[PDB]
Design a protein around this nucleic acid. Structure first.
Ligand SMILES: [Cl-]
Ligand SMILES: [Cl-]
Ligand SMILES: [Mg+2]
Ligand SMILES: [Mg+2]
Ligand SMILES: [Mg+2]
Ligand SMILES: [Mg+2]
Ligand SMILES: [Mg+2]
Ligand SMILES: [Mg+2]
Ligand SMILES: [Mg+2]
Ligand SMILES: [Mg+2]
Ligand SMILES: [Mg+2]
Ligand code: NA
Ligand code: NA
Ligand code: NA
Ligand code: NA
Ligand code: NA
Ligand code: NA
Lengths: 154, 95, 156, 140, 186
RNA sequence: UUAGGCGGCCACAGCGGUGGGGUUGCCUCCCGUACCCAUCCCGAACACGGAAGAUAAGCCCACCAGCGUUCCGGGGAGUACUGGAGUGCGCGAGCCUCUGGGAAACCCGGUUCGCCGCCACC
RNA sequence: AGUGCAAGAGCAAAAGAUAGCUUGACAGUGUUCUUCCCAACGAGGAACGCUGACGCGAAAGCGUGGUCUAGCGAACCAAUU
RNA sequence: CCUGUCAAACUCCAAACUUACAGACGCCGUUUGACGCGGGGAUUCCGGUGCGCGGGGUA
């Protein structure tokens, strides 16, 4: 399971690429989604590879983000442990997170919006003109690499 | 194109690799298809008759009845629905 | 006319003589020079390596070759060495010599397409590299910057 | 092994390559059966431009008709060697050609499952000279 | 053989056994084929149908297994052919086959030929086959009369030992008669 | 399939070559022209009738890789080319990095001297 | 090689050659595709059917001209069945 | 035998890629009626630029 974060805008990006991001529930810059590692999903992120940031987050980080940026399918309701418990199959955020990471369920299945609308990275990201191997912030990341981004946008 | 005949730009698609040259096996020219079957359209360079317009080479239609021995296959050109009169010699079962 | 007009390989390959007529003969006198009776049984083998893909008009080929071989007469008319220019001017070139109306030009010459790193010239010598000098003069008359590379020769 | 390997005469063709005939008559008597017209191919300067056109006749003799003919033909010929085929044939003379081969030749002349005769089973110039020479005359 | 570009004929064409152009016209009918084949000593008759991995023979008859019904004569002749045709024709009927087209392979369409005899037999067996009556032998030759009369010009038995000296087109009738009722494998 | 008929795929099956096989039974060559039929001339072929002989052809069986072909290992080569991205480089031609694909020739070593279906059959 | 003619393509027990016989280069009415990719548009073209009548073949079958893609033309008036 | 080179109108080979159909996932539609069908009204048929691939041209 990988965390997907659109870092580049729609203007000028190929339509067939933009449509993909939309198929992955991301319709805005800084929006993030959680995607299973399947052949079908792998092909998609590869095509989106140049306008996004992805990787496998750590249990903790996912938990921090879920708590800070998860939302019900509808409404303001804060998704905190109590919410998770009184609304999902799990008993708390950690329980949810674990299930997500092990790809046993999805934010939808649990009545949650497929999108984690993050905040601009505090301190700024590494740049949207170069990939990670080049000191940029585009493409695949380290679990430590993804966590830093996600956490800076917590 | 410099001309607009049906065979314009068909040098490649309507030619056989040197080894597949010569009269084709009769087994596939006699094959029988049932209405509803999916078939792949491809002209046999060695088989003169029962052809369809080269533009459709590559299509995968649905057999829907026949006319004489030839079959009537429905395809969709772009967004337009069309019926193609073709013989077994130029058809293959999908899958 | 200037090499500026034909030194780039931006056009399609134009070489089918069955569809092109009126092609000027080549100015290149010979491709094999020196002791062509003998086979490459020499100690040293230096080469002239083009450093960029370019088109070289038969004009430059003959001028570059002559300048090199004509000089290799620092060894004598029947000296002991063999010189070879391995490229042939296959690419026919035109000129639109009406303005931009019906501008497909008429055959005016031929050139040889050489890719960066190919060796256009190859000489064979005994430890007597005057050839290295024959090439400082040769790549002096061809568009690209060149590399004078020695192969069998650990006799430095 | 032998018996089915020993040579035999298969047809003797007697033809008169004229250039435009009355000649058939003598061929009919010299052999014993009707001659066949000889059309020609290609248009040529020897006022022979006509494609389909009688320009000679031939006669293919088989079995006794062939021997009974050679029992007079051969005597009228001297030559041998060099003048022989690579398949053990030979023509002399008005032409008279003799086609020679061994027992299982039908395998290559029939319609069904026909097949070309193996080089080993072919007849050599030498093996030919022998057979014939061994039948009323001398080689070279 | 010579190069990558060389064209090798289909195996059955190399073997000079199958005429693929005729086979295609044959398969057009969409009916079973009545394969009529010969050998120097025998005559075979098969009823073939089309199959996924090759042809399927649903009924056949060989001139050899003719004796199995009382044949004591040679098996490479006209009476033999007809009979093998009728035998196969019958076994065919038993197999649920009702019509077929005559495949004579690489043989020639000569009038009164054995393949047509084979066709006549199959037809009489009850099989429905597109034919032409006056391309067939005149019954008597089918019976083997042409051979009996040939032995009339005897002086020496036409049959080395075999059966009879003056041969029997009657033996033909007895057999056809036999095949037209009961008996095993029919 | 101790030799057959009809085929499918249509060279992995082609080309060339070696060895083996028929005592009654199979295919052949083979023997032979009164008939059906036949050669613009020939029972060569086609067609018909038949077993004195033969396993030399064919054919069937076993095998050889020299040529052609098919597929595989290792090398060539993650090279050539390439879909996506870049305020990376270069006067420029053009190149480079990240990402997703990825060859051809050729060399060396294996493979391949057909596979399969239906029917009939000491 | 040949297959009438450009070029590309098809074809070997043939689509080529020869022989023999024959006039399907027949009458009528359609389906489909093309003309006009997608996506509307005429004449024209082709493929594939049906009805009738024929030619050939033992027969399956082949013949809706010449192997395939060029050789074509509205209304009005005239002539003709 | 050896040795030196090529192809828009060459090909024993051969991608990336584009493309027909089907299944899966995704997204979407069944009160926001998608897909599709019928009808009313248009505007429009001087375009331009960047990038990739081009063809012509010294440019
Ligand atoms: Cl069509
Ligand atoms: Cl047969
Ligand atoms: Mg909401
Ligand atoms: Mg700040
Ligand atoms: Mg920045
Ligand atoms: Mg092309
Ligand atoms: Mg033997
Ligand atoms: Mg036609
Ligand atoms: Mg008017
Ligand atoms: Mg008139
Ligand atoms: Mg394309
Ligand atoms: Na073919
Ligand atoms: Na002008
Ligand atoms: Na220079
Ligand atoms: Na004549
Ligand atoms: Na043998
Ligand atoms: Na029309």
């Amino acid at each position: 399971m990988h965390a997907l974060v659109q870092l580049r805008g729609e203007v000028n990006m190929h339509t067939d690429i933009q449509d993909t991001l939309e198929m992955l529930n991301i319709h805005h810059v800084n929006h993030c989604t959680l995607v299973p590692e399947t052949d079908a999903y792998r092909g998609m992120v590869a095509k989106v590879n140049d306008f996004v940031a992805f990787g496998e987050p750590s249990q903790e980080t996912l938990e921090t983000v879920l708590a800070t940026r998860a939302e019900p399918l509808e409404g303001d309701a804060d998704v905190d442990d109590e919410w998770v418990a009184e609304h999902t199959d799990y008993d708390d955020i950690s329980g949810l997170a674990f299930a997500l990471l092990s790809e046993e369920t999805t934010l939808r299945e649990q009545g949650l919006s497929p999108t984690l609308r993050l905040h601009p990275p505090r301190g700024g990201h590494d740049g949207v003109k170069h990939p990670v191997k080049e000191g940029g912030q585009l493409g695949k990341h380290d679990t430590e690499g993804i966590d830093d981004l996600l956490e800076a946008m917590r | 194109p410099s001309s607009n005949g049906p065979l314009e730009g068909t040098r490649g698609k309507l030619k056989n690799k040197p080894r597949d040259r010569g009269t084709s096996p009769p087994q596939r020219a006699v094959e029988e298809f049932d209405d509803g079957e999916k078939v792949h359209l491809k002209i046999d360079p060695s088989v003169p008759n029962g052809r369809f317009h080269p533009r459709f080479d590559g299509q995968t239609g649905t057999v829907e009845g026949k006319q004489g021995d030839a079959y009537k296959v429905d395809i969709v050109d772009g967004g337009k629905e069309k019926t193609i009169i073709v013989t077994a010699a130029h058809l293959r079962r999908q899958e | 006319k200037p090499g500026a007009m034909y030194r780039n390989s931006s056009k399609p390959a134009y070489t089918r003589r069955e569809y092109i007529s009126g092609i000027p003969g080549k100015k290149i006198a010979q491709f094999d020079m020196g002791n062509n009776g003998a086979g490459p049984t020499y100690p040293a083998q230096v080469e002239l390596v083009v450093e960029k893909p370019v088109q070289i008009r038969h004009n430059a080929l003959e001028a570059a070759r002559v300048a090199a071989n004509r000089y290799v007469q620092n060894s004598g008319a029947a000296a002991n060495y063999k010189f070879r220019i391995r490229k042939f001017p296959f690419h026919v070139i035109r000129e639109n010599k009406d303005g931009m109306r019906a501008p497909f030009g008429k055959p005016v010459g031929t050139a040889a397409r050489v890719h960066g790193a190919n060796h256009i010239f190859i000489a064979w010598v005994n430890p007597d590299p005057n050839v290295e000098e024959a090439w400082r003069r040769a790549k002096m008359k061809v568009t690209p910057t060149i590399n004078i590379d020695s192969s069998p020769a650990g006799n430095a | 092994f032998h018996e089915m390997r020993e040579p035999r005469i298969e047809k003797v063709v007697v033809h008169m390559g004229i250039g435009h005939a009355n000649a058939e008559d003598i061929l009919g008597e010299i052999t014993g059966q009707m001659p066949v017209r000889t059309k020609a191919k290609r248009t040529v300067g020897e006022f022979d431009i006509r494609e389909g056109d009688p320009i000679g006749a031939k006669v293919t003799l088989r079995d006794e008709m062939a021997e009974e003919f050679l029992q007079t033909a051969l005597p009228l010929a001297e030559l041998a060697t060099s003048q022989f085929d690579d398949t053990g044939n030979f023509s002399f003379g008005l032409d008279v050609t003799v086609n020679l081969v061994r027992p299982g030749y039908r395998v290559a002349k029939r319609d069904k499952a026909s097949r070309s005769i193996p080089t080993k089973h072919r007849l050599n110039p030498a093996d030919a000279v022998a057979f014939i020479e061994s039948t009323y005359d001398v080689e070279v | 053989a010579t190069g990558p570009r060389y064209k090798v004929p289909m195996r059955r064409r190399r073997e000079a056994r199958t005429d693929y152009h005729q086979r295609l016209r044959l398969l057009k009918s969409g009916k079973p084929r009545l394969v009529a084949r010969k050998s120097n000593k025998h005559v075979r008759a098969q009823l073939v149908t089309l199959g996924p991995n090759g042809d399927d023979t649903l009924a056949s008859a060989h001139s050899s297994d003719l004796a199995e019904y009382g044949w004591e004569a040679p098996t490479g002749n006209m009476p033999s052919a007809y009979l093998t045709g009728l035998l196969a024709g019958l076994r065919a009927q038993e197999a649920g086959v009702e019509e077929a087209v005559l495949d004579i392979g690489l043989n020639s369409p000569t009038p009164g030929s054995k393949v047509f005899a084979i066709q006549e037999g199959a037809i009489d067996a009850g099989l429905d086959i597109p034919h032409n009556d006056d391309v067939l032998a005149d019954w008597q030759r089918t019976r083997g009369a042409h051979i009996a009369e040939y032995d009339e010009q005897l002086e020496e038995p036409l049959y080395s030992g075999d059966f009879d000296a003056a041969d029997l087109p009657e033996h033909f009738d007895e057999l056809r008669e036999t095949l037209l009722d009961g008996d095993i494998e029919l």
